[PDB]
Design a binder for these strands. Structure first.
Ligand SMILES: [Mg+2]
Ligand SMILES: [Mg+2]
Ligand SMILES: [Mg+2]
Ligand SMILES: [Mg+2]
Ligand SMILES: [Mg+2]
Ligand SMILES: [Mg+2]
Ligand SMILES: [Mg+2]
Ligand SMILES: [Mg+2]
Ligand SMILES: [Mg+2]
Ligand SMILES: [Mg+2]
Ligand SMILES: [Mg+2]
Ligand SMILES: [Mg+2]
Ligand SMILES: [Mg+2]
Ligand SMILES: [Mg+2]
Ligand SMILES: [Mg+2]
Ligand SMILES: [Mg+2]
Ligand SMILES: [Mg+2]
Ligand SMILES: [Mg+2]
Ligand SMILES: [Mg+2]
Ligand SMILES: [Mg+2]
Ligand SMILES: [Mg+2]
Ligand SMILES: [Mg+2]
Ligand SMILES: [Mg+2]
Ligand SMILES: [Mg+2]
Ligand SMILES: [Mg+2]
Ligand SMILES: [Mg+2]
Ligand SMILES: [Mg+2]
Ligand SMILES: [Mg+2]
Ligand SMILES: [Mg+2]
Ligand SMILES: [Mg+2]
Length: 174
RNA sequence: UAAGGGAAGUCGGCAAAAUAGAUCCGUAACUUCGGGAAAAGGAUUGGCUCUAAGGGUUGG
RNA sequence: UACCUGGUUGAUUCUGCCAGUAGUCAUAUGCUUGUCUCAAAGAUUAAGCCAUGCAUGUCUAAGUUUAAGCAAUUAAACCGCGAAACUGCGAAUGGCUCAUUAAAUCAGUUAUAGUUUAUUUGAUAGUACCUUACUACAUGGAUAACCGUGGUAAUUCUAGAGCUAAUACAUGCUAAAAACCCCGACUUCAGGGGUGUAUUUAUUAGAUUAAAAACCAAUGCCCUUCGGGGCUAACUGGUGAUUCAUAAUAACUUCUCGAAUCGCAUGGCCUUGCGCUGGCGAUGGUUCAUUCAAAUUUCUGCCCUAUCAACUUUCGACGGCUGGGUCUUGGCCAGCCAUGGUGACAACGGGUAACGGAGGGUUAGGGCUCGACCCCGGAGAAGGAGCCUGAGAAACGGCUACUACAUCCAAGGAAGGCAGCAGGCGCGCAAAUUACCCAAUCCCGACACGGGGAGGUAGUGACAAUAAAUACUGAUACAGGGCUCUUUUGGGUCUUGUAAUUGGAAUGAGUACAAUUUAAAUCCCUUAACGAGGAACAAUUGGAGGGCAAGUCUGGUGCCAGCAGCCGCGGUAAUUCCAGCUCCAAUAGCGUAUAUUAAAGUUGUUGAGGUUAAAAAGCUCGUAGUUGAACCUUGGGCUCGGCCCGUCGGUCCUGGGUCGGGCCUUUCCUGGAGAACCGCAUGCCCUUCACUGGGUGUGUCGGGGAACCAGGACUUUUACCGUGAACAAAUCAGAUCGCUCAAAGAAGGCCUAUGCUCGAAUGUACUAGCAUGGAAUAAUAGAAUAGGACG
RNA sequence: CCCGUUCGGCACCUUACGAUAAAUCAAAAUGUUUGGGCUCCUGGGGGAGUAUGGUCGCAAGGCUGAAACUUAAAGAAAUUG
RNA sequence: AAAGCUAUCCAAACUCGGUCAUUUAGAGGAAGUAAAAGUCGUAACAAGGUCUCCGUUGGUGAACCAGCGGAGGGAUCAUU
RNA sequence: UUUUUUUUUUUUUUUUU
């Protein structure tokens, strides 16, 4: 069977716009990202919700299609944490910005919760198996943490921090 | 009249051979549009027994 | 997310193209390449040629066993396993490719009342019918396997000779009794023959439209208070529609089927006879229905081309009739007759580097383009044709013949079809191992057991896609931005950088005990002891004048070499070449070439342009086509209801607007099964003008207007719009679930457990077809020689 | 011959509520606020109205009518020299 | 009941012509395009020194010239 | 209103309060 697969980013329409290049570099440095692709990734996803939210606003308020689809969109937004309970219904979705979707990343939250003291150290720890969510170890910095899950981040029980067992370097100096 | 070859004969296919009636089919370049044209090239053809069509005259 | 920029000029506004830009599930190629998940992959050209190996076989108690086979069995009488062979079934599935093919395939929608059907499923068959020497307590003859004798160089070649089985082949009796038609000696009224199903022919039934009196022609029958009455009966299926379903009669047949088959359990009865009976199954069998289907078939819809305008018809072209052939209809074919059929609304012919579609890419809307290829349909197996077996084939891992190619040879002969899976050659810009296995998905077989290059697994694999390493950090010294002061003792220690100055912790790339995965392995996942200080475990691809982010740097060359998609650079001061340094863009990726899309309002229906930039025929007539003046029921009123816009909030009723319904204003019957109006049997209020305690479903007088069934009559017809039914999955949009997130997938979650549960949604069917409503808009008819309407 | 009205013509003069890139236009207006009806033609410049096929003509020629290849401009109206 | 045989039918294949479609060789001839410091003239752009252009015909090394008819895209929007 | 032909290739400009 032909297995479905898709793309998570788009190359910008104009390759060498000075304003666009500078704005992207603001997000890369602030959040300690890797390249421009995962910046384009978040913008593509953010466009998807914004495109979907706008197309429903064109319908009728009483129209059942808008009611079901609109509430479905908000539930993911509220659950993820980019949106609050007081943001009804969809006019506040259009105010979402690329920055807002970026704090919900595990790289940012591990830093905003004081686990790491620099955003570059924060990403390194996650990818290096030193951060777990609940009972689950997560090593993907793009892991989007929900508000419910935001209260269950701590170091891994196998890591020298939290677990206590010395690592390879500390054992070597013995 | 001649086996096999088929112009190697000869200045040269000279001489001979080959084709040939009728019916049906098919017919090129070129053209002064009239022709070429029977172009080229094919098929049938006997005997016997039948069948059908194609007329006239006189009385409606 | 409805978008532009550079380039004609000394400068300007345009027409207009070129270039730049981005996407592609779109191919190739260059450089580079650490990890995880998923994964395309000899289509383009040569449907070209193929060495070799494999890809289709199959046994249950339940078809046939004397293996001189095993295993325990009895002298014997034959079974527990089980080979060979006969028998049955399958081999017509699957897999591969896209050569042919343009009303053809195909798609949606129709029909088979014009047909066949192995298998599955449910039913389903009583027949004195007539042949053998006869039998039903049971018929006959062959042939394998086997023993032995060979042939040829050679084949999955076979002969001669001796046996021997059937669920292989061929025969063959039947069940009583009822009822019906025919023949019938017998004074005016016994007996014998035939009657299952299958086939063919012929005939009959298979009904039903409102009622009554006369010579009957024919017996009129019964009831006869001997007038007169009833009566040759009662019942009778289905479809919109049939000569249908079905029944009956007269016959017919190279006379089908109606069990001479196998296993388990073995039990009952009395006339004790090796007597009569008893289930479950297996296989098989006629008809009907059903299933998988197949085959034709109705309507509508296909790219370019007029430098294709007429095509078909001698020898079928359009049709009618009779017959043949077919499973069946049909010019499908054979005979006879007639002259038709298609076309400017594009027939016929030609091209396709054309299999059709679901769909892929890209788009605000309208579109453009691709679709060999994981799914459905079609066709093919080197190129044509023919055919056997078979339910099913015009089969090719079947046969026969011809052409091409090709193999062995003792030269007499024999044998062949990779567009099946690997592999090779050739071809090309262009595409992988002559690996492992049926464990998973399913299929086939006599079948729980065997087989499956279908299929899965692994290897090659920068097709494409997802996640994501190449580093983290403290202090010291310095600088900057602040803060109270400017006595500038300024770092004093809030922050950020430079720290070429140092100390630290952590880990995976790799590696490997062990565990895990798997048919067995690999990898991922898990994890002992290993594995990091730059020299290491070292990221690349393009560029730095503009479009377009980034150099006023240095050396070399000197219109040379060279660069440059375009404009342009280079002639001894090159921001463009060759290099060093520095920087910019993307980053495990980047560049290049070709195809296509947007940009392109540069194909314009939406939506281009035609005085001068390309473009109004020299002018007029005119056919096809396209388009075409106005005009026919409007207005008003009576109302009734839904929804929306306000205050009333009943628990923790109100006006207006819109929409719809019936009536007035010149505006369907038959039987009504229930409806109903006119009064209702009761009932209801009322002028003081008849008292009351009853009765749901209703009968009749009667029924202007109505949904109900079912028969018929009267409806102008098309276009258009609304609604409804039906309308493969997959794809797309889209709902849910922490595969560690993601691409994905259809999972999962809860309880400690005992086992408990939600899901696996929803939308999408343009055009053509079906049903109904709407009656403006666009067409067409109607009464004029009235051959007009009305009882 | 004079004055005026009207229909139908050949044109002209001023103006822009409009149009066009502009020159200019009572049509080249009523068009991004884009749909009255019909026909024909054009898609950067060349090659080229050429080659070939067809057809008409006595001929000269007419009508129909490409492609390979090549090129970053060709061209229109105005401006200052 | 095998071989064989009679007559139709389906019909491969080959030969011989015809037609369509698509490629391809060719002496020679006549064009186009491109490349530049080649020879000869100077036809056009000003009244380009004979105003330019169109159709047709004839001629000439070459651009071109001339006759007939037309146009202004003219060097005249005008003479009472 | 006598006539007056020709001129070898390339080279001829940028930013803001
Ligand atoms: Mg001689
Ligand atoms: Mg557009
Ligand atoms: Mg120009
Ligand atoms: Mg310039
Ligand atoms: Mg382009
Ligand atoms: Mg198949
Ligand atoms: Mg049955
Ligand atoms: Mg006929
Ligand atoms: Mg017939
Ligand atoms: Mg093809
Ligand atoms: Mg092909
Ligand atoms: Mg055959
Ligand atoms: Mg192969
Ligand atoms: Mg550079
Ligand atoms: Mg640039
Ligand atoms: Mg810039
Ligand atoms: Mg245009
Ligand atoms: Mg011109
Ligand atoms: Mg012009
Ligand atoms: Mg004119
Ligand atoms: Mg009309
Ligand atoms: Mg006039
Ligand atoms: Mg164009
Ligand atoms: Mg052109
Ligand atoms: Mg000019
Ligand atoms: Mg002049
Ligand atoms: Mg001029
Ligand atoms: Mg000069
Ligand atoms: Mg000169
Ligand atoms: Mg000169």
């Amino acid at each position: 069977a032909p297995r479905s697969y898709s793309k998570t980013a788009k190359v910008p329409r104009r390759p060498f716009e000075a304003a666009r290049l500078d704005s992207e570099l603001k997000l890369v440095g602030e959040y300690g990202l890797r390249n421009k692709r995962e910046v384009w990734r978040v913008l593509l996803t953010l466009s998807k919700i914004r495109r979907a939210a706008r197309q429903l606003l064109t319908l009728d308020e009483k129209d059942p299609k808008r009611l079901f689809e609109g509430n479905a969109l908000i539930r993911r937004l509220v659950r993820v944490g980019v949106l609050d309970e007081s943001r009804m219904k969809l006019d506040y979705v259009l105010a979402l910005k690329a920055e807002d979707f970026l704090e919900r990343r595990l790289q940012t939250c591990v830093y905003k919760l004081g686990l790491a003291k620099s955003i570059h150290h924060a990403r390194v720890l996650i990818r290096q198996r030193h951060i777990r969510v609940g009972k689950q170890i997560v090593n993907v910095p793009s892991f989007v943490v929900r508000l419910d899950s935001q209260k269950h981040i701590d170091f891994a029980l196998t890591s020298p921090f939290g677990g206590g067992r010395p690592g390879r370097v500390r054992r070597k100096k013995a």
